Design a protein around this ligand. Structure first.
Ligand code: YRJ
Ligand code: NA
Ligand code: NA
Length: 303
């Protein structure tokens, strides 16, 4: 009864504050009951492919990503690429969503997804005008930047990912712009990419953005990120709090300020201690940079 399960999970994620726990508990139930394995078996049957992919896309949570990686990554990447090739916009959104989440597991899994065509599929879809698809693409590239590690940055350089990112950063949609800028803020730690970023001028988009958006309202602006990111994702963003580039530090501080507000309402403020962001934030709350300092201080107060 996929149509009914997909509706339940969609409604669960959408509950403000509680949707994080509700979606996680349902998606974990799917794994423990054997339903996740059934979806992976069915996603290679042409008749059951899109319905299976539609539910997979909504349940690629932390532990389920591990399960897919261990049991059938090649099948899931294939279905996602099939979906991006389909003409229906509903399909394109699903395929790009799957790939966005498969880039949030590990360096090695990013390498496998790239090997199987996942990055090529995302870059191809960057040509679309569909906002939801483009939002998935920008998020996928931010995730790949955060999780790919050094090996995969060389592969991003060869495929000219920075080039695909800069147009997304100048997009007028705030969610596309934000996640494109987050990817860029992460990648400037790579000195070869840094040169291209400085020439682009995209980093100049940060100061107008963070001073014009209230972190709390921005969180509520898109259902997909209303509950924030996982501690494993935030752990990987912590180093940007001490980036070489002032603009990147500013964006990371804004992000942590937003996450602090969200995690306060969930009772998960302890994750910041676990990922050693408290000390990284305390340092920024004392530095001369007034923009980043204010955001980090508000984050600590929210924590
Ligand atoms: O609330 C969340 N996500 C919320 C959300 C919303 C709508 C859909 N989905 C689906 O879930 C899978 C991605 O999972 P995520 O990478 O976790 O987003 C994908 O299939 C996605 O379509 C998730 N995450 C979270 C938060 C706090 C902590 N924490 O406090 O440690 C840990 C994790
Ligand atoms: Na919310
Ligand atoms: Na914008």
């Amino acid at each position: 009864y996929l149509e009914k399960i997909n509706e339940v999970i969609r409604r669960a994620w959408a509950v403000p504050t509680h949707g994080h726990e509700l979606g996680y508990s349902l998606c974990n139930s799917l794994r423990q009951s054997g339903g996740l394995d059934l979806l992976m078996k069915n996603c290679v049957k042409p008749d059951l492919q899109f319905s299976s992919a539609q539910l997979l896309e909504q349940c690629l949570t932390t532990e389920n990503r591990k399960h897919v990686v261990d049991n059938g990554l090649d099948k899931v990447v294939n279905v996602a690429c099939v979906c991006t090739k389909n003409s229906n916009m509903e399909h394109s959104r699903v395929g790009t969503g799957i790939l966005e989440h498969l880039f949030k597991h590990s360096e090695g899994t990013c390498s496998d997804v790239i090997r199987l065509g996942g990055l090529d599929a995302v870059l191809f879809e960057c040509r679309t005008s569909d906002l939801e698809t483009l939002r998935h693409c920008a998020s996928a590239l931010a995730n790949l930047s955060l999780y790919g590690g050094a090996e995969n940055q060389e592969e991003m350089i060869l495929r000219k990912v920075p080039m695909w990112l800069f147009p997304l950063a100048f997009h007028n949609d705030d969610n596309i712009k934000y996640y494109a800028c987050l990817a860029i803020a992460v990648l400037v730690a790579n000195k070869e990419i840094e040169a291209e970023v400085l020439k682009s001028g995209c980093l100049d988009l940060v100061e107008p953005f963070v001073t014009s958006h209230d972190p709390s309202a921005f969180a509520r602006s898109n259902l997909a990120h209303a509950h924030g990111q996982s501690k494993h994702w935030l752990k990987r963003l912590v180093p940007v709090l001490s980036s070489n580039r002032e603009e990147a530090r500013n964006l990371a501080a804004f992000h942590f300020c937003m996450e602090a507000g969200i995690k306060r309402e969930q009772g998960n403020t302890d994750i910041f201690r676990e990922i050693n962001a408290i000390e990284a934030l305390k340092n920024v709350a004392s530095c001369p940079n007034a923009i980043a300092s204010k955001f980090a201080a508000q984050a600590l107060r929210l924590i």
